[PDB]
């Protein structure tokens, strides 16, 4: 996350931190995700498409820090990793960039909700937030495009939804954005998602309820003039989600 603030998992209790174990045992951070039911985390397919072996993945819930522990955190294996069959990408845009991870504890259980571990409500295709709405993005991604390392602590910021009509202009993203994607950015282009934030939640408040509106997917850069963050539009994948969960 470029700009914004550090946060704690109490402020985003659906946030899932996804890591991968390598051959020799070293574990690296992959991507964010969101808990949508006790057994299911939703994320982005591009996070896993090069390494789709489920056994290598580690999912944490209730975790506020990258390499230190948070009391009440819970660790999971991935029982099923489901990538979208029609995922595609060019050198910039990701299409159908959505993935499901069925999570399972060492003890064979799904998540137990707590103060720091909670599901987030799925959106409805009838209840879109209007352009100009402010939404929250969260993740462990780079604080600058030029940073080699990720931050040691979760961050969050606020961005505003941008209309499809506007995002499709040649000087924004033209034909690279579709109606299955949402654009969002800072009006002054100083806060944004970045590398490492993929798979994480774009959350908007609808009728007072925190709702999973987007999944961090791609951008030309991070906090870059006329180049918004682009998010998978969750309300346009409800059948896919229900079929697989």
């Amino acid at each position: 996350i470029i700009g914004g603030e550090f946060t704690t998992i109490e402020n985003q209790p659906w946030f899932a931190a996804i890591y991968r174990r390598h051959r020799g045992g070293s574990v690296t951070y992959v991507c964010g995700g969101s808990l949508i039911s006790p057994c299911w985390v939703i994320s982005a397919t591009h996070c896993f498409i090069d390494y789709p072996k489920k056994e290598d993945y580690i999912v944490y819930l209730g975790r506020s820090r990258l390499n230190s522990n948070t009391q009440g955190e819970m660790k999971f294996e991935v029982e099923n990793l489901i990538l979208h069959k029609d995922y595609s990408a060019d050198t910039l845009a990701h299409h159908n960039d959505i993935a499901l991870l069925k999570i399972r504890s060492k003890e064979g259980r799904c998540a137990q909700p707590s103060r720091t571990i909670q599901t987030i409500a799925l959106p409805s295709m009838y209840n879109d937030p209007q352009f100009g709405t402010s939404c929250e993005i969260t993740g462990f991604g780079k604080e600058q495009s030029t940073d080699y390392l990720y931050p040691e602590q979760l961050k969050m910021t606020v961005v505003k939804l941008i209309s499809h009509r506007e995002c499709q202009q040649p000087h924004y993203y033209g034909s690279e954005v579709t109606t299955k994607m949402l654009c969002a950015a800072d009006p002054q282009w100083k806060t944004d998602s970045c590398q490492g934030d993929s798979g994480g939640p774009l959350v908007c408040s609808l009728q007072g309820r925190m709702t999973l509106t987007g999944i961090v997917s791609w951008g030309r850069g991070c906090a870059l003039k006329d180049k918004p963050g682009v998010y998978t539009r969750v309300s346009h994948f409800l059948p896919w989600i229900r079929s697989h969960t």
């Binding site: 090069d50 030029t146 940073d147 997917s217 791609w218 951008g219 850069g221 991070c222």
Partner: peptide, 13 residues
């Protein structure tokens, strides 16, 4: 490598 990213790689500082 860095063929799959959120956004095209930027040289590190």
């Amino acid at each position: 490598g860095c063929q799959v990213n959120y956004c095209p790689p930027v040289p590190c500082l």
